[PDB]
Write an enzyme that holds these catalytic residues in place. Structure first.
Site, short mmCIF file in Angstrom:
data_model
loop_
_atom_site.label_atom_id
_atom_site.label_comp_id
_atom_site.label_asym_id
_atom_site.label_seq_id
_atom_site.Cartn_x
_atom_site.Cartn_y
_atom_site.Cartn_z
N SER A 116 33.91 39.76 57.67
CA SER A 116 35.07 39.52 58.53
C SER A 116 35.82 38.27 57.98
CB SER A 116 34.63 39.30 59.89
OG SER A 116 35.56 39.51 61.17
N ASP A 233 36.32 50.48 62.72
CA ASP A 233 36.34 49.14 62.96
C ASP A 233 37.79 48.63 63.31
OD1 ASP A 233 36.79 46.43 62.33
OD2 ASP A 233 35.50 46.44 60.59
N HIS A 263 32.70 47.22 63.96
CA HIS A 263 33.17 46.17 62.93
C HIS A 263 31.61 45.58 62.57
CE1 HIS A 263 35.04 42.69 61.21
NE2 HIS A 263 34.84 41.98 61.81
O1 LIG Z 1 35.66 37.13 61.64
C1 LIG Z 1 36.01 37.51 62.54
C2 LIG Z 1 37.61 37.94 63.03
C3 LIG Z 1 38.07 38.34 61.88
C4 LIG Z 1 39.61 39.03 62.12
C5 LIG Z 1 40.13 38.38 63.47
N1 LIG Z 1 41.54 38.67 63.89
C6 LIG Z 1 41.48 38.19 65.15
C7 LIG Z 1 42.65 38.14 65.96
C8 LIG Z 1 42.41 37.85 67.21
N2 LIG Z 1 43.26 37.75 68.39
C9 LIG Z 1 44.49 37.94 67.69
C10 LIG Z 1 44.95 38.14 66.54
C11 LIG Z 1 44.03 38.31 65.48
C12 LIG Z 1 44.31 38.37 64.21
C13 LIG Z 1 45.16 37.22 63.79
C14 LIG Z 1 46.18 37.94 62.61
C15 LIG Z 1 46.64 39.38 63.03
C16 LIG Z 1 45.39 39.72 64.13
O2 LIG Z 1 40.29 37.55 65.34
C17 LIG Z 1 39.25 37.63 64.34
C18 LIG Z 1 38.06 37.51 64.26
N3 LIG Z 1 35.22 37.91 63.55
C19 LIG Z 1 35.44 38.82 64.64
C20 LIG Z 1 34.85 38.44 65.85
N4 LIG Z 1 33.01 38.07 65.83
C21 LIG Z 1 32.42 39.02 66.50
N5 LIG Z 1 31.19 38.97 66.05
C22 LIG Z 1 30.55 39.88 66.94
N6 LIG Z 1 29.37 40.31 67.00
C23 LIG Z 1 28.84 41.33 68.00
CL1 LIG Z 1 27.36 41.84 68.11
C24 LIG Z 1 30.00 41.74 68.81
C25 LIG Z 1 31.27 41.06 68.70
C26 LIG Z 1 31.66 40.33 67.85
O3 LIG Z 1 32.78 39.66 67.39
C27 LIG Z 1 33.08 37.27 64.73
C28 LIG Z 1 33.58 37.92 63.23
#
Ligand SMILES: O=C(c1ccc2nc(-c3cnccc3C3CCCC3)oc2c1)N1CCN(c2nc3nc(Cl)ccc3o2)CC1
Length: 289
Positions: A116, A233, A263
């Site tokens: 991510s 995703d 994802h």
């Molecule tokens: O690295 C990240 C990640 C990457 C890209 C992202 N983009 C945004 C975002 C949020 N709000 C408004 C705009 C944006 C973007 C900003 C620019 C445009 C859109 O948030 C992000 C987070 N993540 C995801 C959450 N995670 C996770 N792990 C998990 N495991 C389980 Cl089991 C269940 C659920 C889980 O969720 C950890 C890893």
């Protein structure tokens, strides 16, 4: 004494002080034998390195020395939560940790693994040091954001970039749309080290900077990589994985698509997660033999 945001003294924990004077909490998983290579694990936004326990223990079982830290603003590291002055801070800090480890364990090849946002960090880290990393494992890396989420967010970004609005945030992400495995979703929602509040807009702007820098970096990227991506995703759009396969110059690039998977591929349905672990095991094994 300096303490983690959870009030634990850093003198009681493995740590590193970054170039800004901030303490980062570190983790290590080393084999009993002599290591074949080093591998840094780069976590994503809002989470922390403890989420990689099982993957790291698998990699250590291949006789790699696995290491990680919580990025600034995350987990047990210092910094205002989910704030970063510029996205390159994350890359700088990975490189400091890699450099420190190569001093302690010289001669070994070094791999990166990132998921991510941590995959964008890994891409930018490899791009800064062409020819230096042996390989990169990317689990749903941030290459292109979900087009709908990106467009809506860039509206809020317009407010923050043109005005002084330090506290504006997005709505929180629905954790259910990121893994089909309900048990893993519940675990994620139960972990006190995870920041599940809506993203501060200033941080989302740095994620936009990450996407822009990754795009510029692709035509220079030459590191070998394995890229794992779910077709459903909702956060890191699979179109970015295809673009990465197309635009990277790497001579050793492989893509595996998980049809219908969400994802968080290494915390997905058991059939997906077992395959993910097996494919990473094979790919790293073939490149450390
Ligand atoms: O690295 C990240 C990640 C990457 C890209 C992202 N983009 C945004 C975002 C949020 N709000 C408004 C705009 C944006 C973007 C900003 C620019 C445009 C859109 O948030 C992000 C987070 N993540 C995801 C959450 N995670 C996770 N792990 C998990 N495991 C389980 Cl089991 C269940 C659920 C889980 O969720 C950890 C890893």
């Amino acid at each position: 004494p300096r303490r983690t945001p959870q009030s634990i003294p850093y003198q009681d924990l493995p740590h590193l002080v970054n170039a800004d004077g901030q303490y980062l909490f570190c983790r290590y998983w080393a084999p009993t034998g002599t290591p074949k290579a080093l591998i840094f694990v780069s976590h994503g936004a809002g989470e922390h390195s403890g989420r990689y326990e099982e993957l790291a223990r698998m990699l250590m079982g291949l006789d790699l020395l696995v290491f990680a830290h919580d990025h600034v603003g995350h987990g047990q590291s210092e910094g205002e939560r989910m704030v970063v002055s510029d996205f390159h801070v994350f890359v700088r800090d990975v490189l400091q940790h890699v450099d420190s480890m190569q001093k302690d364990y010289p001669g070994l090849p070094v791999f990166l693994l990132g998921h991510s946002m941590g995959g964008a960090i890994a891409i930018l880290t490899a791009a800064e040091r062409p020819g230096h990393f042996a390989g990169m494992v990317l689990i749903s890396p941030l290459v292109l954001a979900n087009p709908e989420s990106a467009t809506t967010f860039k509206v809020l970004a317009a407010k923050v970039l043109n005005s002084v609005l330090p506290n504006l945030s997005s709505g929180p992400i629905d954790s259910s749309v990121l893994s089909r495995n309900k048990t893993e979703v519940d675990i994620y929602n139960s972990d006190p080290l995870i920041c599940r509040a809506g993203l501060k807009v200033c941080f989302g702007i740095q994620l936009l900077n990450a996407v822009s820098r990754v795009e510029r970096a692709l035509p220079k990227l030459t590191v070998p990589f394995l890229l794992l991506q779910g077709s459903a995703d909702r956060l890191c759009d699979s179109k970015g994985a295809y673009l990465l396969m197309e635009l990277a110059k790497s001579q050793d690039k492989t893509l595996k698509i998980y049809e219908g998977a969400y994802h968080v591929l290494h915390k997905e349905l058991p059939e997906v997660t077992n395959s993910v672990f097996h494919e990473i095991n094979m790919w790293v094994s073939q490149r450390t033999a």
